[PDB]
Structure 1
Amino acid sequence: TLRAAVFDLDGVLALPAVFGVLGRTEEALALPRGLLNDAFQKGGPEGATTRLMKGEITLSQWIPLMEENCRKCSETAKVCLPKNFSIKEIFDKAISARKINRPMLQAALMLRKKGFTTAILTNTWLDDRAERDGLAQLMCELKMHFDFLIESCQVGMVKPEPQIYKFLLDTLKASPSEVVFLDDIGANLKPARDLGMVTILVQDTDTALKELEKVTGIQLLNTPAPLPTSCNPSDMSHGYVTVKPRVRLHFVELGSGPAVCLCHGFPESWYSWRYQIPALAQAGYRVLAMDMKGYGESSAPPEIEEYCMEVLCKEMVTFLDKLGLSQAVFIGHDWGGMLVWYMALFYPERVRAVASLNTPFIPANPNMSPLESIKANPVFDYQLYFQEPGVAEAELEQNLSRTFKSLFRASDESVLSMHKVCEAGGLFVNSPEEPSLSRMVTEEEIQFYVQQFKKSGFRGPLNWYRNMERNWKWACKSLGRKILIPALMVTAEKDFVLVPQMSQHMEDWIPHLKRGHIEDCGHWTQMDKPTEVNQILIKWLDSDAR
């Protein structure tokens, strides 16, 4: 029967309540009990604070009116306010201390996942202080998780006026008995309850959550840790840059701060970074997640030599030039990781810092052809199969749904033997026609990749493997160099192709290399262990790339 949940911001979604700092300021400054709370409510509906909450005046205009109220209240109480008494200082510290109440936000996110319509209904102000960015950042993090945000200063109404509850019901398209309303101020619940809404008085979070569980029949407390926030492709800013007449690169962009370029592997997309993009932007970075050349909405020319590392790296430099970025942090995975090590070796001035997931830096051997080194390792047999143009394309393009369902699996769900691929005659020869869905991905996520590969097929992506000799000759020019800029290597325990053991001599070439290791993680690092990848990247970015 319940289908909507409304939360207050102050004292419910964000703690501590700014209204609660008045009480602690009185105790600390030895002022009479309730003095600051009386100055705050001085005048009722015609008072300065109601004008502030309705949007009539801004926070900076209200501050000197609250100071007059503090002096008028002190005169009647026969007391004096300290010499260094400042409403501005008190409110700046209170607003700054207020952080998201993670268990409450998690309960709102869980209710929304179970079909509920969620909203924030709050009494708030137009913040024009020099420190207003701190509040703006808080509202941005919260608003993306709610269907509606109704702020008093924008609608010209305040709680507890009954018109704001009528406006709320109209916005929700719901009747009062279908709505749960959470607030920490008793007076604000009274009108919601007169209409017939379920009300919860929030004193402590745990008791409020227990009441919320009992009334919704959904478990909110003691539940498992949720996955990080993912991207909705239709909500992203899409960017397009022409790097050369026939080549245009597509990317998705989120955040402000130092530029971080994400480079996916084979056969993937910018969408393989869906769990890292919101996390990295929230950490204070401007994230650019590319569709590499040959993929998705980026150009996919047919010529093999359009995908050799020298051309790919030069186009990435042109990409930074056209965007007006002197530097970017480069983070790659699989083929993208191979590219980011070569960006650091050939264009160090354009690379702020470099990180690779799974892909180690392996220097070229001038005495041995790379095609002969691939034969020496039986797990790289699928790369010999990828050499002849047209062969692997026909198999991989035959059934796109089967291709992605067979590839994107956790280490214990594997359905492909990566060795004896050539001898067997294919990649999917001993594979089921209808593979089960992996616990790592949803059907909707698989369909995104299917839609992307319907456009240009596998020719461009497979050409990344068909320049072994050209790449070898190019890399041989860098054998005398070392990587002396900040660098991170992240290994994945259960990647049976790019094994952690293949990275063990990297310190000889990158002496100050930092490391990360992920246990129980397969090849598809980003979607296998997203919380762990995020934590490793954010910690390294904050210390070495800033």
Structure 2
Amino acid sequence: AQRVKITTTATPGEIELAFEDTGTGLPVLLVHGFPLDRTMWKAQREELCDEFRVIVPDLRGFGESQVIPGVATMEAMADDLAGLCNHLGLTGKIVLGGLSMGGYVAFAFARKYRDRLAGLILCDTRARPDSPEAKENRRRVAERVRREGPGFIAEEMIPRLCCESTFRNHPEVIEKIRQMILSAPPEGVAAAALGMAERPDSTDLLPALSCPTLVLVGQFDAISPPEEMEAMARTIPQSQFVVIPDAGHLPPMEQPERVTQAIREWLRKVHTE
């Protein structure tokens, strides 16, 4: 992996990002969820790199990236991605994928950097903003995690993140996810929780998208359910919708080969030299 200070148009103008960059050819940037890190895309990065260049950063405040206290807006995270692409000399078009919060970041990127997208991959996410109670729950999480760390988040989220079959067949995946959460920097978690609370409604952005979009969801996703994601996909032009069997909210980890294949075959259609 690499760690580089990038220039970003978001406050504070420069930030150190840790990232993986594996493969050659057409660039695919994959954005993790909350409160995870780049390692949740490891299987896809290690497999797709035979055909694509796969870039997987830790977002600001997560993993090994710099922590910027306060509020980490989805826009700021998108600005950081643009700055990373600039650093790397990826100044033309990319495919951008995101899971959950990473999907929120992808919408912020599409809003601001439309001309840099060859395609979007939206996994286990939604375009609407937080409801008022959800916003308040962000704030409650932020205030507590600063002091207690993320153990209480792992306790609340793990049962909602993966399906029954994953608990049975893949306890090692459960434990990897748990360690991602437990290791997340407390102030990075807080800043992103507050940022998510203030993200805009992206509902009306979706019909205005100008690139092919793959929408992926676990069959048993308890957080962003398949019915809801299918309806979201119906609002996006040039969309393809895929349900991954025997996965919950984290298909890339729960059913890595299925996710890799779905992404690979779509990329072959979209992302050409």
User: CA 1:343 to 1:321, structure 2 compared with 1: closer, same or farther past 3 Å?
Assistant: same
How far does the alpha carbon of each residue in 1:86-140 deviate from its partner, in whole angstroms, 9 at most, with x for none?
xxxxxxxxxxxxxxxxxxxxxxxxxxxxxxxxxxxxxxxxxxxxxxxxxxxxxxx
Residue number in structure 2 paired with 1:132:
none
2:7 alignment counterpart:
243
Distance 1:448 1:467 in 2: 23
Q: 1:141 aligns to what?
A: none
Residue 403 of structure 1: how far off its partner (Å): 5.0
2: distance between equivalents of 1:341 and 1:544? 19
C-alpha spacing 1:393/1:348, structure 2 compared with 1 (3 Å): same
* Matching residue of 1:321: 86
Decide whether the 8 Å contact of 1:270 with 1:290 is kept in 2.
Answer: yes
**C-alpha separation in 1, matches of 2:83 and 2:100:** 22
Q: 1:293 to 1:352 in 2, by over 3 A?
A: same
CA distance in structure 1 between the aligned counterparts of 2:181 and 2:37, rounded to whole angstroms: 11
Q: Equivalent residue for 1:332? A: 98
**Cα distance in structure 1, aligned partners of 2:247 and 2:19:** 27
Alignment of 1:535-546 (within 5 A): 535-546=261-272
In the other structure, the counterpart of 2:231 is: 505
Query: Cα deviations across residues 424-449 of structure 1 (Å, max 9, x unaligned)?
Result: xxxxxxxxxxxx99824269846863
1:334-354 Cα offsets, whole Å, 9 max, x none, are 100121133223312111110
**2:164 match: secondary structure:** coil
Matches within 5 A, 1:356-367: 356-362=122-128
Q: CA offsets, 1:273-322, max 9 Å, x none?
A: 1211111102x101111101110111111112xx1122222222222112
CA distance in 1, matches of 2:110, 2:245: 27
Residue in 2 that maps onto 1:489 = 215
- What does residue 301 of structure 1 align with? 68
Q: How does 1:102-141 map to 2 (within 5 A)?
A: none
The 5 A counterparts of 1:60-209 are none
**What is the 5 A alignment of 1:387-466?**
387-388=139-140, 389-397=142-150, 403=155, 406=158, 410-412=162-164, 439-441=170-172, 445=176, 449=180, 452-453=183-184, 457-466=185-194
> SS of the residue aligned with 1:441?
helix
Alignment correspondent of 1:534: 260
Partner of 1:273: 41
2:161/2:222 contact within 8 Å kept: no
Specify the structure having the higher radius of gyration (Cα): 1
Looking at structure 1, the residues matched to 131 and 157 of structure 2 have their Cα atoms a distance apart, in angstroms, of: 29
Give distance in 2, aligned partners of 1:280 and 1:492. 20
Match in the other structure for 2:117: 351
Amino acid at match of 1:279: E
Q: Secondary structure at the match of 2:224?
A: coil
Q: Percent identity?
A: 21
* Alignment partners' CA distance in 2, 1:451 and 1:515: 32
Alignment gaps of 5+ in structure 2: none
| 1:120 alignment partner in structure 2 | none
Greater RCO structure (CA 8 Å; 6+ sep): 2
**C-alpha distance in structure 2 between counterparts of 1:358 and 1:450, whole Å:** 18
Q: Secondary structure at the match of 1:359?
A: coil
Give the superposed CA RMSD: 3.2
Distance 1:257 1:446 in 2: 30
Question: Post-superposition shift, 1:408?
Answer: 8.5
For the residue of structure 1 that corresponds to 2:131, the secondary structure is helix
Question: Do the aligned residues in 2 keep the contact of 1:313 with 1:342 (CA within 8 Å)?
Answer: yes
* Alpha-carbon contact 2:2-2:19 (below 8 Å) kept: yes
The residue matched to 1:390 in structure 2 has which SS?
helix
TM-score scaled by length of structure 1: 0.44
Structure 1 residues 500 and 347: alpha-carbon distance in aligned structure 2, compared to 1, 3 A threshold: same
Match of 1:515, SS? strand
Distance 2:131 2:149 in 1: 22
Deviation (angstroms), 1:522: 0.8
1:371 corresponds in structure 2 to: 131
Instruction: Give the counterpart letter for 2:39 in structure 1.
Output: Y
Counterpart CA distance in 1 for 2:150 and 2:242 is 35
Q: CA deviation at 1:406?
A: 4.4
Distance in 1 (alpha carbons) for counterparts of 2:256 and 2:77 = 27
